[PDB]
């Protein structure tokens, strides 16, 4: 049932970037693993050790102001932004995929201005909070400063929250 992504749009603070954003990138949600090899067994197995540093990145190719004006902002996690993306599907009805991500803008990379090529600024928000929804349905909600890694409702850290006494 071919889905595929058709169109994409990017918010920062309500301000739509319906225009300059030829690339989005959601934070690669990865676990930490640590290949556990130990007594009684050959071949490792790998363990949930917590997630990796979620970093998201978009790249407007316009001097956009509304984006540049969050860089290094004293209040880390002030930059909010929402990465919406419509997946078409061969049968018409498009699936809204939307990923709000309160984080810290971190860095800004304007590449080679060449007087004949889309300048293309770049950005890389060090994501703090991150909720990825599909068809208006929470699939992920990863909150580090709180410990709320919750796959569609069920909170997989509800058991470690207690043992830590949070």
């Amino acid at each position: 049932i071919p889905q595929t992504l058709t169109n994409t749009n990017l918010f920062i603070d309500g301000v739509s970037f319906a225009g300059d954003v030829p690339s989005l990138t959601l934070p690669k949600l990865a676990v930490k693993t640590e290949q556990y090899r130990a007594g009684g067994m050959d071949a490792p197995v790998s363990i949930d050790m917590g997630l990796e540093a979620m970093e998201a990145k978009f790249s407007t190719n316009g001097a956009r102001r509304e984006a540049l004006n969050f860089f290094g902002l004293a209040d880390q996690s002030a930059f909010n932004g929402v990465f919406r993306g419509s997946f078409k599907g061969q049968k018409g009805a498009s699936v809204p995929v939307v990923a709000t991500l309160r984080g810290l803008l971190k860095e800004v990379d304007p590449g080679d201005w060449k007087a004949g090529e889309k300048a293309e600024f770049k950005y890389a928000v060090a994501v703090s909070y991150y909720k990825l929804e599909v068809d208006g349905r929470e699939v992920y909600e990863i909150d580090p400063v709180n410990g709320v890694r919750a796959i569609n409702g069920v909170d997989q850290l509800a058991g470690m929250r207690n043992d830590l006494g949070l």
Partner: peptide, 25 residues
Amino acid sequence: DRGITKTYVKDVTEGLRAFMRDLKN
């Protein structure tokens, strides 16, 4: 204030979830 956009409802429901979450923390 501000012209209600399609995303107005969401901007606010998330902004609320930010302040609210911080208070929980």
